[PDB]
Amino acid sequence: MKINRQQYAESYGPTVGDEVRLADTDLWIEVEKDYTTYGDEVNFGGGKVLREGMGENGTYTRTENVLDLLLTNALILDYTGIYKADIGVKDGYIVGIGKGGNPDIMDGVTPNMIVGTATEVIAAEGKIVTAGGIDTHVHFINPDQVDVALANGITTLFGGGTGPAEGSKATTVTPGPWNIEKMLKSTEGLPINVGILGKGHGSSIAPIMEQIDAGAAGLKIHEDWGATPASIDRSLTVADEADVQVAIHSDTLNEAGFLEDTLRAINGRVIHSFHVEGAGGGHAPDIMAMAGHPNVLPSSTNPTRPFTVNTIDEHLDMLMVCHHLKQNIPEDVAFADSRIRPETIAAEDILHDLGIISMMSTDALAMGRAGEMVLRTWQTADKMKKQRGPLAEEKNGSDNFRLKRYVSKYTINPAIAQGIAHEVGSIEEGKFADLVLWEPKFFGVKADRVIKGGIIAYAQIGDPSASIPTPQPVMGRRMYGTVGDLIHDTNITFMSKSSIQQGVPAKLGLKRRIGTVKNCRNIGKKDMKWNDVTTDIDINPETYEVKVDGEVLTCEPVKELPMAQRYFLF
């Protein structure tokens, strides 16, 4: 008996060779392989396969290769591939990607993916499943920002801040041992993974290091605290001893140096360059040239992504508003004009497409949108396809190469940069079960269900008083993973090795899973998945034109984007 492919895809989700449109973009992903056995697909419901003695095994206890959760028929979109598989979760971690069911009667069941008495089922047929997004540029300013992030598929927030204090409103910093301890305690109530950055500023080691020992997971060097050669140097010396990452927002004003002075202070050490294009901050006008260097892990923030017809007008005004610049004082206008540049924003699009900028991030609430990192990633890839054509490396009519290059920017790459990719950032066996299910029509726009540590934390779901969960109003809502003490087991607080060894979690009474930051001093650009290009980026000081390999990088701004007015009420 045979099933035509249309009917097959309607019932079980797509299979090898089938393509799926990402939202309302022109991007198509193609199923590269499928781990199923046709005819033995797992599915759940009345008269369906996962029933005792059939697709569900009735014999084995939980410890005997039985899963806590099986996501059936997922279309995985990940740096590792775009393919169809069942995903098995146990003890809050991904333990199997393959084919779930009952070895009694089905062929090809992955040995540790038995559906048993202990197994919950999530039907992923017809959904795209990705890792939770890893946002490494978060200003902790307003707790309402967490739901915003969850709603767009973000599951880890790395950054700093103490709420709407001016230091935090400008910089991703939770300064000193006491504020760090306070924010670690606050974190016990935030339904998302978190890592906290201390102030990457000082001329003596001890003031900086004590933040690490107090429980910070990294440092942020920001020009508003003095992004001087000394602060850069001391922070990197601390990071190299502590095995944590350093983010930098460099000296825009070129007060103590130009870009080459900040690179000399870095002295080949690994650093994460935030908002590398520079609208969000950095040596004017040439900070983006950091993205060419081997020791730099470069990320963009999202307001410049992608370059649109309202981008400059919005940013010039935004900058004026936030820096209290008058359009009167020539110095303020000249400063703004030196910072917001169509030439570098247009090139930023292209540098993302070439794999020279490796990461995306938000800059939530400081100059970036907490719920638009994923959204704008895909808008940029769609714009690039239209303006630059399918990349040379593609195959069928598919955009798989571009899709893997771009999904990497907000999942695995930020995780590797921050030293947390052993735990999060991709759908791989042995990693925490932070998973995001998307309907293809809403892909990258609004997540259907966000799984955190193997329990659904956030979902688009309807009337709580209705007979079924689908009636209106369907809206993003926190689910049982965020309630009670379950919030502790479904989320990870990432911390330095030293704070963990010194017993900070016990000292503070932290109940969350504690994640160890590690392996972030021995990496470079080459370790950025699908975005590992090093090259000499030249930014003309007079014209701001960006050149790579002797070619000017320029593209036009677009009047319209997909993943926009078709979806949002405002």
Added chain:
Amino acid sequence: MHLNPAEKEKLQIFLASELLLRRKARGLKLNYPEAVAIITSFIMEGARDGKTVAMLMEEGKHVLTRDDVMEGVPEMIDDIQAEATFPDGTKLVTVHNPIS
């Protein structure tokens, strides 16, 4: 008033529909949440009016047509479901493929 949780939430659908209706009146092609809000509120108001579930299943297919909405919106909306208090209590209305 003694508002319960569902009554409070459902006020927001009426408000979204009012917003959407104003957008349609000034000539805009409606988007996904606007279209869903209009149809949803129509169903809930129909229940309040005392129509039957069968009348609303029928009428809900004629509230908005493809020319009222953006490209792709008809195909995005497979069904709209709403629960409201009819003269005989709460009932569920499902409108299948409301916009052809």
Added chain:
Amino acid sequence: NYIVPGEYRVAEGEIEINAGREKTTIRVSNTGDRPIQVGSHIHFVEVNKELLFDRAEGIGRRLNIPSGTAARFEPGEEMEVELTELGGNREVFGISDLTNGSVDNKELILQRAKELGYKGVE
């Protein structure tokens, strides 16, 4: 061209289910007065006693229908169905408690089926 958000563009061809497994066609009658619907993956010999068919021909098999679908028998309805072979270890446990082990133990399965009144043994 017109954009349907999230649409599929499926490849050409068809998907063959349960490929490479022996197929068997048998006649089955619902002798009861209530409807019986049978899922794709239930060990066929262990279905409702009032279904009359050659029980031996259900041993180690299941319906050869798309995963998650079912065959329906209205009261008094007799029709042919196509079975396929069970795979994996070819063991069945639970369900009607007729096998509880290898499906190769045909004599034991049939003895139990007959004693409990599952119609169509021999």
